[PDB]
Amino acid sequence: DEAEASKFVEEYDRTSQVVWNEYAGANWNYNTNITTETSKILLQKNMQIAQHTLKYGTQARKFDVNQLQNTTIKRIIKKVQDLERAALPAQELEEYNKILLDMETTYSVATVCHPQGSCLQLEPDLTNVMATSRKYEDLLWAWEGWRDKAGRAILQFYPKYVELINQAARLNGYVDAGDSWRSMYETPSLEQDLERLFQELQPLYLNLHAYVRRALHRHYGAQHINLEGPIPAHLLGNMWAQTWSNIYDLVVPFPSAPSMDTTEAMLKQGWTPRRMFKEADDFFTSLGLLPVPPEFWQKSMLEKPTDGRVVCHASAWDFYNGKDFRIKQCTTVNLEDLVVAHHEMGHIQYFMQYKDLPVALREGANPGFHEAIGDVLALSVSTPKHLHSLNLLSSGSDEHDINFLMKMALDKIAFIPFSYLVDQWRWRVFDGSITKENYNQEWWSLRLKYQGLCPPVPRTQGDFDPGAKFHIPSSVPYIRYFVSFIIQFQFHEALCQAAGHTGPLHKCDIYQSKEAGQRLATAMKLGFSRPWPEAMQLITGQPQMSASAMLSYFKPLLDWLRTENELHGEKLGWP
Ligand SMILES: *[C@@H]1O[C@H](CO[C@@H]2O[C@@H](C)[C@@H](O)[C@@H](O)[C@@H]2O)[C@@H](O[C@@H]2O[C@H](CO)[C@@H](O[C@@H]3O[C@H](CO)[C@@H](O)[C@H](O)[C@@H]3O)[C@H](O)[C@H]2NC(C)=O)[C@H](O)[C@H]1NC(C)=O
Ligand SMILES: C[C@H](N[C@H](C(=O)O)[C@@H]1CCCN1C(=O)c1ccc(C(=O)O)cc1)C(=O)N1CCC[C@H]1C(=O)O
Ligand SMILES: [Cl-]
Ligand SMILES: [Cl-]
Ligand SMILES: [Zn+2]
């Protein structure tokens, strides 16, 4: 009756755990040891997973979900009927598995070489060049070189990947793969919701862009910077211009205020990756949240290992037995990686909070929620006060404040258009409005229209700049990070009120608030069990996504930018 459904979900649950546990293992062993062997064993455990999905997913398809009374079991069964790639016929499944492997690998082993000099990798070499060099020509060398070797090299596999991920979405009942992705939020009004959210951030973003443009004009000179045109995409301190905080020192509002490079100070005081994660764990436990188990310290890879190996992109790992969780990060000892550690630590925290739900229901209330936990804590960590107490700053005034808000704005506000544009591009690739004759040009339309950037070198057929960003070859959806950046402010705003904080939201530090831990924990325990507005409502007292907490956090900076931009006559925007 209803009792065959009960028995099925029970059985899918027990067998999931085993097969997922074995595949997590092999997937780890390869990400920390790119070989042809580990390559194999994984392409192997991929088959086993696929066959477990096909068999439970076939059975789930046989139940009429209409007729189910139990809401939890309805929801599990509905989700298991989505086989994903396992829906592909054997040949294409094999081809698709090969393509993704080849895209990841290509991206991860790319190097940019000086002629008769030596060869730079993405992490940490090209990252450091992008972060610290202040020579137009050196930045251009790294920016173009990366697109030339990672970008172009992905172009050969993308149309084939597109057809396969589309085929699988069709055979699971969606129209294309972007439709499939959008459905993880169960929110039919999503595109307009995000559009509305994006439009509310424009005044802050335009104001920051104009102010930074003026600062680059001053450093790199009038012949290199059009004061009414887009910013050249290689001057923002980051490979993708997706965060700008590495150029903080070109744009300091109040340089007469005392300041310490945090990065400078961590190095002096002999901080290690271990310390960075220990600090993050301490922040989690200060709120009454879970510590990572002892196993996590034994088993994680928290630095690039030394013995000539690895996938360096930071990621968090659930191994699906509720005891083994891990992080794999090639940590640099800087502020940027300290934030990243917090980010990954929040994914770990979610894994532990939801470890007792059925597996099908082990996900964020929405993917945006999974992305926001670590970030919320890190907004507290980043406060001057908190950093003072870490012995990483000297630490008052209106001046110090604006400076601080400007550091934050170079991370949070600048990323808003970036994080928005990625899936706008991919959605259009998936639904077939953009073709391989068009990939790059349409990537540039979006970079220009949302971010107000231009390529420093004309692009030519043969370029595929999207493949130069990790999530594109690895096929990881990106809109999550846009949702994250909005909702992390809302959460931060709510946790500050729970914690008894008063006055300006950007002074809040929720370290050691047990009230704040409780809101988060009950939200995270829900997993993917309830529509996400219910978790929003638990954390924040209402159920909608809203820009107003972000706007209100940055409100002093927006007043400052307007006054400053107006003094100088800035024309906000670009043509
Ligand atoms: C609809 O069915 C759900 C899910 O049922 C659970 O999974 C099924 C496949 C069956 O195997 C059931 O045996 C199993 O209960 C019901 O949800 C579950 O409700 C119970 C309360 O009976 C929750 O249990 C709690 O568990 C903790 C420790 O784990 C205890 O401290 C609590 O005191 C309590 O016993 C259980 O967590 C919950 N399961 C999930 C995953 O949500 C659900 O109640 C049912 N709806 C109704 C009212 O019919
Ligand atoms: C470095 C951060 N890395 C990602 C990430 O952590 O999101 C990595 C790679 C892809 C996802 N990821 C996870 O570790 C992760 C693991 C599991 C889950 C889940 O189980 O639900 C979700 C994510 C990132 O890319 N970021 C972080 C912020 C901005 C974005 C970027 O750098 O472009
Ligand atoms: Cl680009
Ligand atoms: Cl997403
Ligand atoms: Zn993440």
* Mutation probe of ligand 2 site: the residue of 107, 130, 315, 419 with most atoms within 8 A of C-beta: 315
Which residues touch 168 (CB under 8 Å, ≥6 apart)? Answer: 83, 84, 85, 87, 88, 96, 177
Question: For ligand 2, which residues put their CB under 6 angstroms from it?
Answer: 313-316, 318, 340, 343-344, 347, 363, 370-371, 476, 481
* Mutation probe of ligand 1 site: the residue of 4, 7, 14, 70 with most atoms within 8 A of C-beta: 70
459 domain residue, yes or no: yes
The answer to whether residue 344 is catalytic is: yes
181 domain residue, yes or no: yes
**Are the beta carbons of 246 and 130 closer than 8 angstroms?**
yes
Which residue's CA is minimally distant from atom 37 of ligand 1?
357
Residue 231 CB-half CA count within 13 A: 27
Which residues touch 413 (CB under 8 Å, ≥6 apart)? Answer: 201, 204, 205, 208, 554
Q: Which of 485, 500, 493 is nearest to 553 (CA)?
A: 493
Looking only at the bridges linking them, the beta strands covering 453-454 and 231-232 are parallel
Token couple for 249: 């020192």
**Are the beta carbons of 178 and 423 closer than 8 angstroms?**
yes
Q: State which residues form the domain around 344.
A: 2-569
* Mutation probe of ligand 2 site: the residue of 324, 347, 412 with most atoms within 8 A of C-beta: 347
575 domain residue, yes or no: no
Catalytic residue among 92, 104, 344, 493: 344
- Give the nearest ligand 2 atom to 242 CA: 33
The answer, yes or no, to whether the previous bond of 358 is cis (omega within 30 of 0) is: no
> Which amino acid type is present at position 9?
V
- Give the nearest ligand 1 atom to 13 CA: 9
* Annotated binding-site members for chloride: 147, 185, 443, 447, 480
Starting from the CA of residue 312, give the closest ligand. 2
Catalytic residue among 217, 219, 400, 471: 471
> Which amino acid type is present at position 308?
G
- Backbone phi, then psi, for 261, in 5-degree steps? -65, 115
- Backbone phi, then psi, for 431, in 5-degree steps? -85, -5
CA of 421 from ligand 4 middle (Å) equals 13
**Are the beta carbons of 292 and 325 closer than 8 angstroms?**
yes
CA of 74 from ligand 1 middle (Å) equals 14
- Backbone phi, then psi, for 453, in 5-degree steps? -115, 155
Angle at the Cα of 572 from the Cα atoms of 569 and 574, rounded to 5 degrees: 125
> Which amino acid type is present at position 90?
A
- Alpha-carbon Rg for the chain in angstroms: 24
Count how many domains the chain has.
Answer: 1
- Backbone phi, then psi, for 126, in 5-degree steps? -75, -35
CA of 183 from ligand 4 middle (Å) equals 9
Residue 38 CB-half CA count within 13 A: 16
- Give the nearest ligand 2 atom to 363 CA: 21
269 domain residue, yes or no: yes
Q: Which of 129, 207, 470, 517 is nearest to 313 (CA)?
A: 470
574 domain residue, yes or no: no
Distance CA 76, CA 54 (A): 15
Classify 18 as helix, strand or coil. Answer: helix
Which residue's CA is minimally distant from atom 21 of ligand 2?
363
Q: What ranges make up the beta strands (E) of 450-497?
A: 453-454
Token couple for 449: 């229209």
Sign for the pseudo-dihedral over CA of 343, 530, 196, 550: negative
E strand or H helix that includes residue 231: strand 231-232
**Are the beta carbons of 393 and 265 closer than 8 angstroms?**
yes
DSSP per residue over 366-417, as a string?
SHHHHHHHHHHHHHHHTSHHHHHHTTS-----HHHHHHHHHHHHHHHHHHHH
Which residue's CA is minimally distant from atom 26 of ligand 1?
356
Question: For ligand 1, which residues put their CB under 6 angstroms from it?
Answer: 6, 9-10, 70, 72-73, 356-358
Q: Residue holding tokens 């698709």? A: 96
Which residue's CA is minimally distant from atom 42 of ligand 1?
72
126 domain residue, yes or no: yes
